[PDB]
């Protein structure tokens, strides 16, 4: 299962000037491209090394798609102002996300496409990819307009054929990086609180993909601290799970780690 | 590649 996903953001800038259009492309958990119009030379650029040698024809197409979106979104921002009876005074945010997922057979599983205005759901392409639903009741005009002009058909074709054709082109392009599994380098650490208490921390570090599960047992559900999965900065990810353990009786707590790159799910305990 | 066409809301 792989996914080609894209994140588009346009923010209106009263006083500052034209709005800010940012496009962020992802192959699974890897960012590979970006377009930012805040820059004076706005072009779709590589953000992964397996894109560093691609050719003008590609960058040209992608800059145009992004440029033409920025153009529409700039208008959409003034249209959305009218729907919501808003003024030229405030800065508002239009967000568009689209993506396709592969099945286990390497064939199209699902496709999604949505719009949001000011962080709240706006319009959504249905699971069938044949119509649009106004999630917000202000999105009702956009919904009739887009269903009546048969817009979904353009997206159904992208999500079902283009997105998938390309997801494979990219997956091959960076086989050595993307498909390679980096399993987490684990270790448990001991940080004493008081004479009575002590904190036992399980560390999952340098893992790709970002999907992981970290659990403490004796099942010990009752008050375990778990931090959000964070990026290391080099492409890999980090995660830790902590539990309040009574002094001396440390070994009574076991850490369970489950990641894709691991043949056997690893279980840990602290070594003094 | 990103979607070549968007929506005019």
């Amino acid at each position: 299962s792989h996914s080609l996903k894209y994140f588009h953001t346009s923010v209106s800038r009263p006083g500052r000037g034209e709005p800010r259009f940012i496009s962020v492309g992802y192959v699974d958990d890897t960012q590979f491209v970006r377009f930012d119009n805040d820059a004076a030379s706005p072009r779709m650029v590589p953000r992964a090394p397996w894109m560093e040698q691609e050719g003008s024809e590609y960058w040209d197409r992608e800059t145009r798609s992004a440029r033409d979106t920025a153009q529409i979104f700039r208008v959409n921002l003034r249209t959305l102002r009218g729907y919501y009876n808003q003024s030229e005074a405030g800065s508002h945010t239009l967000q568009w996300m689209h993506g396709c997922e592969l099945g286990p057979d390497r064939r199209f599983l699902r496709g999604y496409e949505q719009f949001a205005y000011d962080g709240k759901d706006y319009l959504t392409l249905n699971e069938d990819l044949r119509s649009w639903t106004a999630v917000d009741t202000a999105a009702q005009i956009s919904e009739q307009k887009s269903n009546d002009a048969s817009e979904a058909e353009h997206q159904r074709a992208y999500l079902e054929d283009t997105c998938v054709e390309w997801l494979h082109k990219y997956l091959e392009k960076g086989k050595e990086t993307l498909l390679h599994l980096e399993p987490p380098k684990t270790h448990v650490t001991h940080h004493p609180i008081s004479d009575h208490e002590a904190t036992l921390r399980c560390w999952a570090l340098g893992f790709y993909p970002a999907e992981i599960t970290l659990t403490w047992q004796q099942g010990h559900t009752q008050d375990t601290e778990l931090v959000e999965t964070r990026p290391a900065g080099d492409g890999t990810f980090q995660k830790w799970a902590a539990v309040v353990v009574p002094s001396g009786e440390e070994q009574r707590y076991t850490c369970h780690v489950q990641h894709e790159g691991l043949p056997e799910p690893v279980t840990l305990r602290w070594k003094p | 590649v990103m979607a070549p066409r968007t929506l005019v809301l």
């Epitope: 145009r64 798609s65 033409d68 153009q71 529409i72 700039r74 208008v75 959409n76 249209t79 009739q144 307009k145 009546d148 002009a149 048969s150 058909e153 353009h154 074709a157 992208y158 283009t162 | 070549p4 066409r5 968007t6 929506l7 005019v8 809301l9």
Partner: T-cell receptor, first 111, second 115 residues
């Protein structure tokens, strides 16, 4: 790229007429325009959904389940239907407001 | 409405000419086409909310622009004999309208390039 057929049509008054349109690539919306000599093309019929048929007076257009063809029919010809009939379309996958035109079909009605 | 000026134009070979278009009020898009003696509507250039959107093989000597007030200008120079045709301006893209992509033309500019 579109292809209109026949290039020219010589019909007798009262006779019905059909006009063909074909794309090399898959299309998603079809537009039919009439152009009276020296004047700007004027919209006759818009088609948005596959197999849909929509009429405007004696004029009737069809979408074509193929997504690559569209037809225009003039029911009873009156001599005023003289002119060029242009076929325009929204190519599937084309960015917003991209729409190709045909090279037109010349209609001649004999009173 | 789609208003075009001048309705007619006669000039000499080598000279420059400027064609104006005022789109339908609310419409954000401007298209320039040229219809020759037999030829259909051969497309030149397209604008969207002041910016260029599409180019369709303009002669380099052909030049265009859309102003913040969505009016447009089609500059043609140095003029050559074969550039004699009807220049049509098309308007669309009003987000207010349900069928935005529906194109509206004006009664063109007839350009006669004479020696």
């Amino acid at each position: 790229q579109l292809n209109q057929s026949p290039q020219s049509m010589f019909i007798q008054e009262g006779e019905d007429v059909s006009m063909n349109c074909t794309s090399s690539s898959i299309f998603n919306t079809w537009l039919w325009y009439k152009q009276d000599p020296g004047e700007g093309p004027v919209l006759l019929i818009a088609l948005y959904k596959a197999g849909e048929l929509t009429s405007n007076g004696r004029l009737t257009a069809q979408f074509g389940i193929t997504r690559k063809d569209s037809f225009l029919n003039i029911s009873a010809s009156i001599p005023s239907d003289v002119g060029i009939y242009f076929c325009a379309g929204q190519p599937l996958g084309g960015s917003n407001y991209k729409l190709t035109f045909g090279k037109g079909t010349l209609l001649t009605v004999n009173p | 409405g789609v208003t075009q000026t001048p309705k007619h134009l006669i000039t000499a070979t080598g000279q420059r000419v400027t064609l104006r278009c005022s789109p339908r009020s609310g419409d954000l898009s401007v298209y320039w086409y040229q219809q020759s003696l037999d030829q259909g509507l051969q497309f030149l250039i397209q604008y969207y909310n002041g910016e260029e959107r599409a180019k369709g093989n303009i002669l380099e000597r052909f030049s265009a622009q859309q102003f913040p007030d969505l009016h447009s200008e089609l500059n043609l120079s140095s003029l050559e004999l074969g550039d004699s045709a009807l220049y049509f301006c098309a308007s669309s893209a009003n987000p207010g309208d349900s069928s935005n992509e529906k194109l509206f033309f004006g009664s063109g500019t007839q350009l006669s390039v004479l020696e």
